[PDB]
Amino acid sequence: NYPAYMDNYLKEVINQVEEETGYNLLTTGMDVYTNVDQEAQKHLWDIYNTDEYVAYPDDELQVASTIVDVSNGKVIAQLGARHQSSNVSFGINQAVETNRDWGSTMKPITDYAPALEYGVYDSTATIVHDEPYNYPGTNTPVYNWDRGYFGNITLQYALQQSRNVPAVETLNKVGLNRAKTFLNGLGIDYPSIHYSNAISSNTTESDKKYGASSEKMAAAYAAFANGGTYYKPMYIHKVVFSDGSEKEFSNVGTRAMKETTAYMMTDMMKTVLTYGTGRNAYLAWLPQAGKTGTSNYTDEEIENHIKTSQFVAPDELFAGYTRKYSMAVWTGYSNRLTPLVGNGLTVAAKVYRSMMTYLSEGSNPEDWNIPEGLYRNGEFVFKN
């Protein structure tokens, strides 16, 4: 016996216990104390499944996400699907799956953070370049989502407008090797990294250790929030054995980036919500910061499976965070060939706005404190 709104979460629980102890809570007796927040779950359950919180263009459009306690990697909510009934208790949880492309949300942790963290750029005001450009060593143009080019613009603006050209070039200056290393620090990895990975989590391999999932993303972005510490995602607190003994589960974060980098990424990302691309997930009273993301079709997919000449996309994402809870949201149809259009592309932000509202309607909305080693200067931030 267990509630349906806890299916996905309970599954992850069963696995973590097995991973650490080697025992299966299904074929062995024991009590387990997890990290879930029940009301948060029912709240999340209501958001997906009802029609009171957000306008789903239909009942098929799927949603999946993970909410993490930025201070310790504790997962306090996870829901892999919506309106998807067929009780097969403990099935595939789309919140831990890496089979989907997180697109643009990949920029902050793959190109820009490393850049700042390694000297490439020294200020959010640095002039980057959005001009015609091909993938390094190749003649394949890196096209901006709208086929246009902005010219010289600041780091911030390029991150806030989600321009591709300045992103893949940034990865070039950071170096793939250093970049892949920096990604590991945040819990993400690929069997092999390429320049396309500057704007896509699409990878040759497909274990689980490779790629990005609402789980991994929310834990990666939590490092910005918590100041630069990477916390392994945790679902279980403690497990008392039938024979009296207990096993307590402790997680110890690691320095993923300097505080400076974290603060800087956070400042550029606060602008994403304001005059940036993440406007639909903006809250005047809540000092949060995030990044919107979109993936794209192959070309064979465009010329053979896409009808409308509208703006389409197999995945819409959002990975926002506050001073307390980091949250990564994925949205798309079960079959990537069914596109997201018009009001369907907006669900990722709203779901995030909605949930994050609830999660912070009380608390005491706090802001970040510019760390020693930096100094403001109008819209931007500079290094000493």
Binding site: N1, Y2, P3, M6, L10, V13, I14, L25, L26, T28, G29, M30, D31, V32, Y33, T34, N35, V36, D37, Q38, K74, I76, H237
Partner: peptide
């Protein structure tokens, strides 16, 4: 045979 799970408020949320 039995295993109980409690949320963060230690209030049992399921029995498996």
């Amino acid at each position: 045979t039995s295993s109980k799970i409690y949320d963060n408020k230690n209030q049992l949320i399921a029995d498996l």
